[PDB]
């Protein structure tokens, strides 16, 4: 990990920016994965899957 | 280096948690759904004599 150390950990400002970026991107990735699991587990039960949606007389 | 790399992973989660909690408090102060539901309508009116103003 010493090569990554020489680019990210030599200065605390870069390290802090790396932490900010990791929070942003990792939270986005986890959100996407959780939503994928949610969709895969609830097939057919969504509002957008109502057969008669738009068809109330 | 390995230690610094490992710690940054949890330092991601701590930053995300802090951001989430602060933004949850800030946005709880924003306009509520009942408030936003009453932001559009139309009203008709008539005529008034010249030189006057109706509020």
């Amino acid at each position: 990990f010493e090569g990554f150390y020489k680019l990210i950990m030599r200065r605390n400002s870069v390290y802090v920016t790396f932490i900010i970026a990791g929070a942003f991107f990792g939270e986005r990735a986890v959100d996407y994965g959780v939503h994928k699991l949610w969709e895969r587990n609830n097939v057919g039960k969504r509002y957008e899957d109502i057969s008669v949606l738009g068809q109330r007389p | 280096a390995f230690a610094y790399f490992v710690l940054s992973g949890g330092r991601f989660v701590y930053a995300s948690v802090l951001r989430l909690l602060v933004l949850k408090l800030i946005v709880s102060m924003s306009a509520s759904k009942d408030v936003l539901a009453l932001a559009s309508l139309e009203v008709d009116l008539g005529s008034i004599e010249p030189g006057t103003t109706v509020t």
């Binding site: 200065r11 400002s13 870069v14 920016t17 900010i20 942003f24 | 951001r19 602060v22």
Partner: peptide, 28 residues
């Protein structure tokens, strides 16, 4: 000539943090 580089690094950090709290992607 290191204080200027420190200022630039911390300015980049501050910008990154700003875009991260407020996330103004629908406004840009």
């Amino acid at each position: 000539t290191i204080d200027i580089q420190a200022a630039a690094g911390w300015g980049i950090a501050a910008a990154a943090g700003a875009i991260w709290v407020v996330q103004p992607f629908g406004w840009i």
